[model samples]
Target: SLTDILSPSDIAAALRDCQAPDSFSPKKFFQISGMSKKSSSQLKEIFRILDNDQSGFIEEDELKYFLQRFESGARVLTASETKTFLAAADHDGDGKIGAEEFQEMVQS
Candidate 1:
């Protein structure tokens, strides 16, 4: 199904070349007019995998790990950046994110 949206090679190429995790914006890549429903679901599942820990938010570590799996050049997130990003997304300060917060952060 994902192949209908982006072939495996397309995904591999994106993982290899994207400068930042944020570069994988669904609004940009998966929003094609002809995208199939199954392809959309697969894309969502792929995003979930990247959002490790099922916290609904993705940290740099999660992104780094995914990048590493593809031999993509990536560095660990600095402590300050991690803290700031987490804080900004975790609006309730519950030390974790829910689906709404995560969607809001990515969409924003």
Candidate 2:
């Protein structure tokens, strides 16, 4: 079904399209219930700091470390799971998940 409906390029296009067309002033936490103003600001600041590469793509290693630091209950995929997920995600079989491929997974 995916093959019939979309391709890698389509995924990339959609990601670009989803971004806000123009920059807007940062807003306070009023929109996000349960989060204090300070907490919301800090969270945005932290994300800005962590996305150092500025490629808009966070790697698996970064995700793993972040989860560990936060003590998240989510389990990191084992090596075997990584292999399977990667294989399924890497549709082009180039041995790495490019941004477009990752985007495609989310879209699907």
Candidate 3:
């Protein structure tokens, strides 16, 4: 299961292929980045990579800085963008997004 482990740089590499959108939309962003095709395990890998504090949950602040976390030179997500993205990904209605929620959002 760990055969294709993803590193921090791997996340950045994927982002390099994605053109940062002027306005963020989780669905459009995932589709354009081709992340919508990733497997559940792959999405889990990405979720863990983005969980900066390793708290098993992706907080609002983390989502706000999501682009920067994915790539050092990436642009930051706007307040509205993050809120919208969070709304879609945080399915449980909690303040943070879990791995399963992220996977389902991308796979949806």
Best-fitting candidate, scored by TM-score: 3
| Model 2, TM vs. native | 0.32
| Clash count list over all predictions | 0, 0, 0
Give every collision pair in model 2.
none
Per-residue error (Å), model 1, residue 33:
18
Whole-model alpha-carbon lDDT for candidate 3: 0.58
Clash number for candidate 3:
0
Q: What C-alpha lDDT, on a 0 to 100 scale, does residue 58 get in candidate 2?
A: 44
Tens-digit lDDT track of model 1 for 8-103: 555455444444544543233323322223332443454432355775555556543443343355455444434444454556656445555544
Cα error, candidate 2, residue 76 (Å): 5.8
Can you list the residue pairs that collide in candidate 1?
Answer: none
lDDT of 2: 0.33
lDDT tens digits, residues 36-71, model 3? 677776765644433566667666676666666546
In order, the Cα lDDT scores of the candidates are: 0.44, 0.33, 0.58
How would you order the candidates by lDDT, starting with the best?
Answer: 3, 1, 2
Given candidate 2, what's the lDDT at residue 101?
44
Residue 37 C-alpha lDDT in model 1: 34
**Every candidate's CA RMSD:** 6.0, 17.0, 4.5
